[PDB]
Structures are given as structure tokens and as C-alpha cells.
Amino acid sequence: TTLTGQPPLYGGSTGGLLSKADIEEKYAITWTSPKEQVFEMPTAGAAVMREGENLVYLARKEQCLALAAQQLRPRKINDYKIYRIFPDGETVLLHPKDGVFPEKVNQGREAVNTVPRSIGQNPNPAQLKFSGKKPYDP
Amino acid sequence: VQRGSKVRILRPESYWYNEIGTVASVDQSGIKYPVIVRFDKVNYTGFSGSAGGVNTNNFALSEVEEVSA
Amino acid sequence: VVVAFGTPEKQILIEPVFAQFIQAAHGKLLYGFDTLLSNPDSIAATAWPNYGNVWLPGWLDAINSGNNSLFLTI
Amino acid sequence: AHTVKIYDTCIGCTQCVRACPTDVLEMVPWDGCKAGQIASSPRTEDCVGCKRCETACPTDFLSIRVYLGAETTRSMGLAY
Amino acid sequence: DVAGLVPCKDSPAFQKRAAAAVNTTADPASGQKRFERYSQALCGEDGLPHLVVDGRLSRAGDFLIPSALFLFITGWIGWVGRAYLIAVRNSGEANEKEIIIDVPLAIKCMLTGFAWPLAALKELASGELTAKDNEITVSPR
Amino acid sequence: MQTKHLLTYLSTAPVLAALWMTITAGILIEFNRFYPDLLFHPL
Amino acid sequence: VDNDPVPTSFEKWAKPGHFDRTLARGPQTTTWIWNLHALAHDFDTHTSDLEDISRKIFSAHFGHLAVVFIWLSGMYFHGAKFSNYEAWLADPTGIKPSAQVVWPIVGQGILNGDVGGGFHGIQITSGLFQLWRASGITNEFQLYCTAIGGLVMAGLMLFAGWFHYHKRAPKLEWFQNVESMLNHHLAGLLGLGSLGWAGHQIHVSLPINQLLDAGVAAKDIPLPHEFILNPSLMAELYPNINWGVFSGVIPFFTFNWAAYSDFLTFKGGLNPVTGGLWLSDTAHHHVAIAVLFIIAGHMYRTNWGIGHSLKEILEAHKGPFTGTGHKGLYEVLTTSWHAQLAINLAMMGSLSIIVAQHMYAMPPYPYLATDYPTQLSLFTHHMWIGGFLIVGGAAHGAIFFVRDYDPAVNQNNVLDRVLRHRDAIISHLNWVCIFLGFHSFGLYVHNDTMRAFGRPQDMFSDTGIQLQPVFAQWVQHLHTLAPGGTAPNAAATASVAFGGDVVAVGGKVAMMPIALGTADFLVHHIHAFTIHVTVLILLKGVLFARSSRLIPDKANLGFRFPCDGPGRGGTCQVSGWDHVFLGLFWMYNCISVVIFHFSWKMQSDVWGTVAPDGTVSHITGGNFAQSAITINGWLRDFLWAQASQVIGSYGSALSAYGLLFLGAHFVWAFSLMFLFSGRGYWQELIESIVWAHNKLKVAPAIQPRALSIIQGRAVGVAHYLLGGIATTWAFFLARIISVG
Ligand code: CLA
Ligand code: CLA
Ligand code: CLA
Ligand code: CLA
Ligand code: CLA
Ligand SMILES: CC1=C(/C=C/C(C)=C/C=C/C(C)=C/C=C/C=C(C)/C=C/C=C(C)/C=C/C2=C(C)CCCC2(C)C)C(C)(C)CCC1
Ligand SMILES: CC1=C(/C=C/C(C)=C/C=C/C(C)=C\C=C\C=C(C)\C=C\C=C(C)\C=C\C2=C(C)CCCC2(C)C)C(C)(C)CCC1
Ligand SMILES: CC1=C(C/C=C(\C)CCC[C@H](C)CCC[C@H](C)CCCC(C)C)C(=O)c2ccccc2C1=O
């Protein structure tokens, strides 16, 4: 919380935030750039990465992750942090939660929604009639 | 099975069900699907418009029947 | 294509002779098949053991008087 | 939210996690394959349902399965 | 004579439109020979050579001789193709062969289609014609 | 030798299909340059 | 310009898929085959170097020039050896132009109907005869040697392609030498061509045509070498020059130009004996065009420090709204081949549309105005070609944005700032499209409903609630109080369509004043609506090709992808390719309505026959002002009524147009299988057919696959466009040949 970082030199665009950012939720990507460079914003147009901490508020998590994947990672920037910010001001760290990126296996991470069978061993809908049971339950 | 053994697939969800493929490896460790089978008919796997698929898949020993030696 | 080029005689025209035979088998003497119910002497027309057709005069007039749509000419 | 289920035919190639646009999946330790890792979905509330993970999955049939369910603002991908 | 049909000879409409024969080809006559050939057919109310597909060995030239001709040619084609597909599956360069036809093998499998039906009978006798149902892929159910 | 890499190119499917089609079209058209209007076998 | 860069060999001819990496592993599935033709001409995918890409483009342009020249040579050969040019030249109105004498194989000779003069052949509508007479050709041997010239010219372009790819291919700085190229193309390609044609107008076209416009019956005039050799023939035609090999050109070198005023004229109007343009005006035209193009090809600094760098012109131009203005567009246009193709395709499409709307109302060839088949055919053809090229310019704009947009070049320039308010642009275009759709088509269906109600006083007609095109009528007024006013040194008006009197050549009408009423207001607002929706779709594809609020990484996905999955509600057809796919149907709609308006307006208010007393009996008798305001009238008096010719066409010279009418209906309806369906069904059905083939040991090595989602869409749009365009083509040709 209390997100630190200079705004990148961006002239603004009509593709940025809407009412949903102010009453439902918004997202912020904070990273640190070694130099003043150029990157394409997900809300279109060029922007100037300031040297040091840069902070960008986007409307969706996927926009922040697209910014991180197509702009920051090919520019060797892999210290970014994506947060969800609620209208009351509450900030929740979202993308590099346990400090390791999700595509590296990290001890201490537990498995969610892992089914101990194959797709073929899933039951039949006819046997799996009126109940809360679905064909993919563990 | 053993490497190079032609085997038939008994996995219904598999693209190569009731078809033969050569065994390329059997994993000595205790995993659920140790057998690597390499086929010649490629898969459906890939994006739309991509000219290709996979010819290599993994199966258990109870989902593979050795026809040859 | 053959009608376009001023040659309608080159049209492949196939008579529905199986359905025309069925129409005759219902009694239409137009096609000249001389078969069941379009021959007055077939055992289907006379119903030899019981002689109890009785529908047949009315139906035969219906099938062999074109003023209706009962088994139209094909 | 959409339902992302990971099936034990997973070879832990991490290709589904690398292709997720909304950070739903992650690699967790698992002794069920040679790679030592299985995909997981702790964040299916962020799932949009694009099925890029199933496109990236090399197992036949797929170890990752996306079942589109109830639609929320996040799963519809609305920036508004 | 069948189904109220008459020969084109005693058909007034036929002779009326034969009196106005168009010329399909570069023959000076053309339409005259077309119509004198079509005269043997069974015409009708429109005076057009209707066809009967009935076996009817007198009027067998309207279906049956062309039927045999087509079946022999198309079965030749199919057997030639099957023989080629079977004979390129042996080589591991089969996928290359389906876009780049191995022309000597193509002619070799082409020229043996003259005995296309008889051989298939032997295949129907042998079992080298239809694949077993446990050697071919199938979806679940 | 390029006499073998012309032969392979003039053995591909688009060229041989076009060749076989042109050939059978030639048979069929020169059939109708000859004895015309054959809707039945004359019998 | 490097020596032997690519070895000329037959080896890669034997290797299909050499030019890519995914295409060279052999064909495992059938999609490979499609991908081959899908990747043949995408040179920027083949390699990753601008030099090789530019060399490939140069050698492909040489090949395309070869195919156009072999086309030209073919048409000149068919006009020399298989036409009735001379007979048509003897009696213009009495002979319909024709070529392509078909082979009498099976019925076919019925299409060789008589056109006049004993010639039995297909009546052509390309307008070739008229341009040959205008150019000054008299006999056919000139056309045979022009065909020979076209063949050797095609051979020259082909060998030039081989030479500039395999033997001496240019380096990048040559292709990127943009100033010298523009100077050589304005002055040298365009100016020299214009001057040389005026060098053919002055010496060949004017004398021959001045003789032909009198009743000389062609052949009695000399071959065109005599009019350079012997200025005695140059005497009686325009005698106010000395006419010598040194003397005649001295009036040019001394500003003595009113001497030349007998052939460099600015008369305007149409020649009342031929219905074409005044060829002296076209000559003086080509002269001035040549001069202005050779002037404009002296503007760009190449090597002598004289002229402009286009970069300085661009980077100079910037204002307070547009930030840095056009900074970086030089690099954008000199590094991206797709960004140049966008502009060049859009401009050639627009200029082809201009060509269509100019050669109808100033017909510039003798005996083309009173060739109604020719007039309709060339208008409609150039409109369709232009619409296609405009959509292609939009397509390559989207390709540039997906592939060749660098944000580092484009910081606060015009490109960057339109990317930053694409939402405002698209929403305002959306609103304009909805407004135009309502206030044009709702007017139409209001008119249908009032006319069905029996309330014609409540319609938008000239007899109901009038919508007069007052501004277009005023512009029309200004073009006729101007052959004596604001164009003083000009005899007649620019075109008769703006006003005047019925120019009637033969018994038919060449061109008359085209008044604009409520029906014309209505169709013009429909055309504006259809253009605006096509612009909306294509601009949305261009401006949102890289990212959107929905998918912020579309540029990573590329230009040509089906979707990003069923999630986010469903993301089918987000790609710029798919916007081009939708804009193709909307271009179809736009151009179809434009050519329908053209056909009905000419057939009702312009085309027709003149009586000896001088009364115009129009082809459809002026139904346009009262029928074209309702959709029922368009269906009845244009689509039902004028299709009688194409459907009664069997058994005559015009049967092939009826056959293609039906065949194009078939192809259009065949399109909807590909358009409405998806490839999951087709893959599933191919699977059971594969089972059948597997049973008889006949399933092929190359696995049968359904066509891809993009391929299915492209097949659907190709069949849809071909079917609809060919239906309209067959309809137009049969109707206006039987009636016009
Ligand atoms: C060797 C070639 C070959 C052979 C023996 C067969 C045989 C068969 N096909 Mg098949 N087919 C082929 C090629 C072939 N096909 C090709 C190229 C296509 C893609 C157009 C198809 C598409 C197809 C469909 C959709 C179906 C079949 C079906 C069938 C079965 C029923 C007969 C039939 O429907 O005829 C119809 C066949 C066609 C209309 C295909 C056109 C014929 C092609 C051009 C012949 C191919 C020859 C090849 C190019 C050259 C080989 C010569 C070689 C020496 C180089 C039958 C066993 C049906 C089935 O499922 O079983 C009951 C069926 O539904 N085929
Ligand atoms: C001496 C003759 C000759 C030879 C041996 C080669 C050989 C080669 N060329 Mg080259 N080329 C030639 C002449 C030749 N070329 C000429 C005259 C031109 C100018 C047009 C070119 C321009 C050219 C370019 C730009 C390139 C090549 C390439 C290549 C190499 C790849 C082969 C290939 O796949 O393309 C073979 C193509 C065909 C067999 C079909 C070509 C289609 C023709 C040109 C147009 C057809 C249009 C016509 C109207 C038909 C329309 C059909 C419709 C009506 C149904 C290969 C070694 C490529 C390369 O370097 O590989 C990486 C490449 O970049 N060539
Ligand atoms: C302004 C350019 C221009 C215009 C209006 C014309 C007009 C004409 N030419 Mg052409 N011509 C030109 C340039 C032009 N020419 C050049 C550069 C060449 C050398 C390649 C030729 C070579 C040529 C030949 C061989 C022939 C003609 C002929 C003709 C007449 C036939 C009809 C026609 O072309 O449609 C009208 C064309 C247009 C409306 C499009 C012109 C626009 C050009 C392509 C670009 C100019 C853009 C310019 C900067 C601004 C103009 C924009 C405009 C939309 C306002 C006609 C009056 C025929 C003739 O001799 O008549 C009897 C004929 O046989 N011309
Ligand atoms: C100057 C003209 C021009 C040039 C040089 C290009 C060049 C290119 N275009 Mg393109 N385009 C153009 C005009 C042009 N386009 C126009 C006018 C349109 C609107 C229709 C398009 C819309 C377009 C799309 C949507 C795409 C391209 C793409 C491409 C790239 C690869 C295309 C390819 O592989 O060839 C392949 C060509 C074929 C396989 C031919 C397909 C069949 C054609 C379309 C129908 C022809 C039918 C014919 C008219 C009549 C029917 C005859 C039949 C009965 C036998 C390439 C750089 C592709 C790309 O990805 O760019 C990077 C892409 O997807 N273009
Ligand atoms: C005839 C069939 C049809 C109709 C009516 C439309 C209509 C429309 N299209 Mg569409 N389109 C079509 C075929 C059609 N399309 C096909 C086949 C394709 C496949 C390629 C497309 C692809 C397409 C694209 C890609 C786009 C459109 C767009 C549009 C909208 C244009 C804006 C407008 O005019 O506002 C006004 C609406 C009309 C003129 C339609 C008639 C309405 C009447 C006149 C009023 C009805 C009165 C009242 C409402 C009745 C109430 C009754 C009550 C009981 C409820 C419009 C609603 C564009 C858009 O979104 O525009 C901004 C857009 O981008 N279309
Ligand atoms: C149509 C066609 C064709 C034809 C072509 C031709 C035949 C052409 C041509 C051509 C030519 C044949 C051209 C020319 C030209 C020219 C010019 C354009 C000129 C110039 C000039 C100059 C440079 C001048 C200078 C001067 C001055 C100004 C100063 C001093 C004096 C003098 C006068 C010297 C072909 C066959 C391909 C094919 C089809 C199409
Ligand atoms: C009498 C007659 C008729 C009738 C006919 C019929 C009714 C029939 C049938 C039939 C049937 C009921 C059948 C069947 C079958 C079965 C199966 C099972 C089959 C088969 C097939 C196959 C097996 C084939 C094979 C092959 C060959 C041989 C060659 C090529 C390749 C292939 C593979 C394709 C009509 C009236 C029309 C006409 C007249 C005559
Ligand atoms: C019909 C249809 C198909 C099936 C269409 C196919 C499979 C096209 C291929 C058909 C032709 C017949 C392939 C020709 C095969 C050989 C090349 C034939 C040999 C040619 C010689 C005879 C010369 C799709 O795959 C599809 C995909 C997505 C959306 C809609 C559709 C769709 O509507």
C-alpha cells in the first residue's frame, strides 16, 4: 500500500480508467527501470519510462499483466508488482505474491483444483444427475 | 514395455486410441504415466491454422498393450 | 446448360416410372401399365375370395378423372 | 467464476502458466511427474476463460481444463 | 412404350422441334444427325427424349451401358488411387509422396487398373481389403 | 542436376492434377468435336 | 547493387515450403497446403531483413508488370485477329463492338451472335475499340504489332526480375532513396508518359481523328508516319503554323502559343458528331499534365543540394493540437513497406472510383457515350476495383500497426495521438453511422409504409415531403454559368451532366443534364451511410489492431488470428484481419448500391433514344423520381423489371449471362456454408469420413483437417463477393445489351 513511483510521461488517452476504477476496483503496476526508455501502454500510445520507480494505474489485471509481459520483460524488467486497489483505498498485492513468479515452482505453494484422474476417468452426467456434483469434482 | 516396442493405446481420450506407436522410453521412477509413445499421426494440438501437432504422448502400463517385442 | 444453348432435346429427362407404376397400382390407367387395380381382372382389383372391395368404383373414378389432386401426373 | 481443473496427466511443462494472461495458474511441487511440478489454479476468480492454457497444453487429452461458468465483471473482461 | 411413353418417331412435337434443329458443333448438318439419333428414343408430350432407368434390355442404352462404363472407369480410378496409397505407406517419405507424386510408381499402379474389379474380389476373398475394427481410431461414447 | 529438380517440380500435385485434368478435358472435348449429342447409347 | 546474391537454380522449385520454417517439415496435416498459399507472398515473414524484402518486392513487381503486359498483348492480339475493329470503325452506331469468337463445340456458337458487319462473336464491353479509335489506330496490323510489343515488353520485365533478384540485386539505400524515386516517378514515369502520349496525340491521334470525324471512311487516310513526314497533311487541319522540322517548334521556344491554339484548345463539352471528348482538348490536357508532372519531379533534394528532403517538410509541419506533428513519419514510411502499401492501395482505389465517376459523364473516347454496355461496364468495373483496393489499403494499415509500428519513433506524433483517442474517433464514427442509417434507410421504409398505407402526401418524394438536394443543384448550376463566366477561354462546359442540352450521337443519347431530386438525395445519403460504416469497420480494425480494453495484447497475437477464446464473453473476430473481412461485405453493400443507383439513374433519366423531332424516350421512362424512394420500387422497377432480360436470355446470343446469373447465385449461397458455420463441425464430420477411409485401408498420409477459422471466413467472403458481384455483372450485361 501507499504506492510509490513516479507516473510515466504519458499524455493520457481515452482508453484508460472509467467509473469502475473509482467505485468497483482498479489495478496498479509498479516497477523499477534502470533508465528512461519508451514503452507502449496497453491503453495505446507511447509512454516514457522514468528512471527509478514507475507506477501505472490500469482498469484490469490483464492489462497490467500485458504491460508486464510485452513491455517490461523484453526490456529486462522483472521486479514489477501488480496490485488491486479498492475504492476505500485498500491495496492488495496480486501478481508476484510469494515473491517468486508463478511459472517457477516454489516450495510452500499448495495445489488448488487438481483432479487426481484423467479426462477420460471423469464420470458421466447421467450418473451425476440431481446433486451439486459436477463431472470435474476431485 | 520396453523402448522400441510397438504398442496399442487403450486410452479413450487419446487421439491414437486403438492405434500403434513405438515406445521411446519407460520411466523407471514410480509415476502414474511412465511410458513415452511416439506416433506418426500427429495430434490436433496447436493454434487454429497451425500446420502440425504432437506425435509424442505419455501413457500408463495399464493403458498400453505390447503387440510386438 | 443445354436449354441455354437452344437445345432442350439434350436434356437428361428421367421418367419417375417407379412412382408412375405405383400410381397405376392405385388405379391410374393413364400410364398404360395394366397392373393391379388398373387392370379390372387382377386379383387385387376383384378381391377373388371375398369380392368385397366396394371402395373401388369411387376410388377408381377419383384416380382416373383429373379434376382433383389425387396422385397427380408426374 | 470459471472453473480451471488440472488433471494428473500433467507433465509440468509450465506452458499453461506462461500463457495465462490474468495470472490464474502457478507451479506447485508434486511428485507425480518427472518435472516435479504440477499446475494449479489458486486465482480462478481472475480467470477470463480464454483457454490459452489448453492451447498451450501438450498432453493428449489436456491436463488443464477450463469450464466456463457464471459470469462476473472479472470473467467478462470488462474494463468498465 | 412404358408409362405412357411413345417413340420419338410417332411424336408430333418431336418432329416439330426437329424441323428447327440448332447446330451444336461445327458440322454443317449437326442438329439433323442429333435428331435422327434421338428419334429412336422414347419421347413424350413435350417431344423430348425421356429416359427410363429400368434394366429393360431393349432400352438398356439409356442407363445400363453408360452405367457399366462409368462404374468401370471410376472403379479403375479408385483402385489406382488405393494401390498408390497402399504402396507409398511402405516408404517413410509418404507425406512427401502425396504432394510430390512418384510418377513411375504412379504409372505402374495406373496400368494395373484394367483388372480393377477382379482383384478387389480376391481382396474381398482375402481380408486384405477391409481393416479390422480394433486397428482404427475411434472417439469415446 | 536441374533436370531432376525440374522433374520433381513437374511432378507436384498442382502441376500433375492440372495436366491430368487438361488431358481428360482434351479427350472429352475432342469426343464432342467428333460424333455429337450422345444422351443415350444409340442401341 | 550486389552481384549474384541468389543462385539461379531449379532446386528450390523441387522444395515446396522452402521460404518458411513451419512449411518445411513435410505436410503432416492438410492445413500445411493452405498455409503454403497463405504464405507465398508474405515476404516480411519469409526473412527478417529489409534489404531482402525490398529485393523480393522489386522482383515481384517485375513479374506483375509482365502479367499486365501479357494481358495487354493478349487484348491487342484479340483485337487485331479476332475482332471487327475496322468494320466497327466504318459504321460506329451500326456495329456493336465485339471480340472473342468462341469455338463451336457444344452449343457454344449460339453465343456468337451478330454485332454488325457479318461478324459473329461475343459483344465485348471493355471499351477497347473506342480507345483504339481515339488513340489513332485505323487498321488491325497496328494492334498485332502492339501485341508483339506487349509480349516482348512482358519478356523484358520478366528478365529484369530475374536480373534484379538473382544477378544484380539492389541494396537497401537504393530502395530507401525516396526523394530521387519520387522525382523519377513524377517527372519520368508520369510526365514523360503524358508528354509522349501528347507526342502521339499531336502527331497521330488528332490528324487521324480529325479525318475520321468527317466521313472519310477510315482507310483513305495515310498511315500515321505520313503526318510527321509530310506536313502537307498537317496543312488543311489547323493551318496556323508553319509546320516544319525546325520552324514549327520555334513558336514553342518563343512563347508564341496562340499559334498553337488550333490544336491546343480548351473547348470542353462533347464532340456533337461522336459523343466523345474533344481530342484537341485531351491533347492540350496531356501537354499541361506533362508540364506539371515534370515540374513536380524537380522538388526533392537528391544530389545537387537543390530541392527538399521530405523529412524536413514532414517534421516542419506541426501544430498546437498535434504535438510534434509529423515527426517520425519519414522513418515510418521509409522503413515499413506495409505502411506505404496502405496509402498506395487506398489512393489507387479512390482514384479508380474517380475514374469510374469521370469516364461516364465525360466519356473521353469517340462512340463510348452511345455504347451503353461499355459505359455501364467501365463505371461498375472501376468502382468495384476501387472498393477492393480501398479495403486493401485499410488491411495493410492494420498490418503495419500490428507488425511495423515502433512506439519509439512515434512519440506524440499524429500516429501516437490518434492511437490515444481511438475511442472518441470510433464512438463518433459509430454515432454518425447510426444517424445516417436511420435518416436514410428509415426514410426509405417510411416511404414504403406510407405508400402501402395509401398516404403518398406523407412520403419523402417530390410529390410529398420534399428533400431537395439544393447544394448539389447549386453546384450543377455553377458548372453551366461558367463556360462563359469563370472559365472564359473555354467553349463548352466541363460535362453535359451539369447542364445544357441533349448531346445525341446517332439515334441515342450521349449525355444530357442529370437533374437531382428527392430520390437522388436519398440514394446519396445511403451511399454516405454505407461509406461511413465501411470506414467505421476498417478504421476500428486499424486503430484497435494492437490493443483494446478487451485484449490488451492483440499485437502479440498478430494481424490474422481467429479469436482469443470463448472467454471474456467471447472474443471472436477481434483481429484486424477480421475487421477487413467484415469491411469487405460492407464495401460490397456500398458499391452494389452505388452501381444500382448509376444503372437506374442512367436508364431512367439519361440513356434512351432521340426522335427525329428531338424528344428523349428514356429506357425505363423516368420511373426513378417516383419509384426509387421506396424499397418496393427498387425491388419492382429495378430488380424485378430489369432482370427480365437476363432470365429470358436462354436460346440466344445472351444465354451465357443467364447461366452465370444462376451460377453466381449458386456461389453466393455456397458462401453461407462457410460464413455461418464453424470448423468444429467440419473436423468432426471429416473424422467419420476418415474412419470410413481407414476401414478400407485408404486414409491418406496427409491427415484430412477442416479448414481453419480464418480460412473458413476467407473462403466464405471470397465466395460471397464472387457470387454477388458476378450476379450483378451478368444482370447488368444482359439487361443493358438487350435493351441499350
Ligand atoms: C484414392 C483416392 C480416394 C478413394 C479410393 C476414396 C474412397 C472413398 N471415399 Mg473419398 N476423398 C478423396 C479421395 C478418395 N476417396 C479426396 C481427395 C477427398 C477430398 C475431396 C475425398 C473426400 C470424401 C468424402 C467427403 C467422402 C468420401 C467417401 C469415400 C468412400 C465412398 C465413395 C465415395 O464417396 O466417393 C466420393 C469421393 C470424392 C467425391 C472425392 C473426389 C475424388 C478424388 C478426386 C479422387 C482422388 C484421386 C487422387 C487425387 C489421385 C490418386 C491417383 C494416384 C495414382 C496419384 C470411399 C471408400 C465417403 C465416405 O465417408 O464413405 C462412405 C464420403 O463421405 N471421400
Ligand atoms: C531462370 C529462371 C528462374 C529460376 C531457376 C528461379 C529460381 C528460384 N527463384 Mg526466381 N525469379 C525469376 C526466375 C527464376 N527463378 C524471374 C523471371 C523473376 C521475376 C518475376 C523471379 C523472382 C523471384 C523472387 C522474388 C524470388 C525468387 C525465388 C527463387 C528460388 C525459390 C524457388 C521458388 O519457390 O519459387 C517458384 C515459383 C513458381 C514456380 C511460381 C511462380 C508464379 C509466377 C511467377 C506467376 C504466376 C502468375 C500467372 C498469371 C499464373 C496465375 C494462376 C492463375 C491464373 C490460376 C529459386 C532458386 C525466391 C527465393 O529467393 O527463395 C527463398 C524469391 O525470393 N524468384
Ligand atoms: C491528371 C492526370 C490525367 C488525366 C485526367 C488523364 C485523362 C485522360 N487520359 Mg491520360 N495519362 C496520364 C495522366 C492523365 N490522363 C499519364 C501520367 C499518362 C502516362 C502513363 C497517361 C497516358 C494516357 C494514354 C495512353 C491515354 C490517355 C487517355 C486519357 C483520356 C482517357 C480517359 C481517362 O484516362 O480517364 C481519366 C483519368 C483520371 C480521372 C485519373 C487521372 C489521375 C492521375 C492518374 C493522377 C493525377 C493526380 C493529380 C496529381 C491530381 C488529379 C487528382 C484528380 C482526382 C483531381 C482522358 C481525358 C487516352 C486518350 O488519349 O484520350 C483520347 C489514352 O489512350 N492517357
Ligand atoms: C498492391 C496490392 C496488394 C499487395 C502487394 C498485397 C500483399 C499482401 N497481402 Mg493483401 N490485400 C489487397 C491488396 C494487396 N495485398 C486488397 C486489394 C485486399 C482486399 C481484398 C487485401 C487484403 C488482404 C488480407 C485480408 C491479407 C492480405 C495479406 C497480404 C500479404 C500476403 C498475401 C499472400 O500470401 O498471398 C496469397 C493470395 C492468395 C492465396 C490468393 C487467394 C485467392 C484470391 C483472394 C481470390 C482470387 C479470385 C479471383 C479474383 C477470381 C476467381 C477465379 C477462380 C474461379 C479460379 C501480402 C504482403 C495477408 C497478410 O497476412 O498480410 C501480412 C492477409 O491476411 N491482404
Ligand atoms: C439487412 C440486414 C442488416 C441490417 C438492418 C443491419 C444494420 C446495422 N448494421 Mg449490419 N451487417 C449485416 C446486415 C445488416 N446490418 C451483415 C449481413 C453483416 C455481415 C458482414 C453485417 C455487419 C455489420 C458490421 C461489422 C457493422 C454493422 C453495423 C450495423 C448498424 C449500422 C448503424 C445504423 O444504421 O443504425 C440504424 C439501423 C438501421 C438503419 C436498420 C433498420 C432500422 C429501421 C430503419 C428502424 C426500425 C424502427 C424501430 C426501431 C422499430 C421498433 C419496433 C418495435 C416493435 C420494437 C445497423 C443497426 C455497424 C454498426 O455497428 O454501426 C454503428 C457495424 O460496425 N453490420
Ligand atoms: C501502348 C502500348 C505499347 C506501345 C508503346 C509504345 C509504342 C510506346 C511508346 C513510346 C515512345 C516513343 C515514347 C516517347 C517519348 C518521349 C518523350 C517524353 C520526349 C522527350 C523529350 C525531351 C527530353 C526533350 C528535351 C528538349 C527540351 C525540352 C529542351 C531542348 C530541346 C528538346 C526538345 C530536346 C506496347 C507495345 C508496349 C504494348 C501495349 C501498350
Ligand atoms: C437393379 C438396378 C437398379 C438398382 C440398383 C440397386 C438398388 C442397388 C444396390 C446396391 C447395394 C445395396 C449395395 C451395396 C453395397 C455394400 C458395400 C459394402 C459396398 C462397397 C463398396 C466398396 C467396398 C467399394 C470398394 C472400392 C472399390 C471396389 C474400388 C474403388 C476403391 C473402393 C474402396 C471405393 C436401378 C433401378 C437403380 C437401375 C437399374 C439397375
Ligand atoms: C464446408 C466447410 C469446410 C469443409 C471444406 C473443406 C474441407 C475445403 C476442402 C474441400 C476441397 C474439395 C478439397 C480438395 C481436396 C483435393 C485437393 C482434391 C483433389 C483435386 C483434384 C481433383 C484436381 C470447412 O473446413 C470449414 C471450416 C470453417 C468454417 C466453415 C467451413 C465449411 O463451411
Ligand code: SF4
Ligand atoms: S500446460 Fe498442461 S502439461 Fe504443461 S503444466 Fe500446464 S496443465 Fe501441465
Ligand code: SF4
Ligand atoms: S467460436 Fe470460434 S472464433 Fe469464437 S471464441 Fe470460440 S473458437 Fe474462437
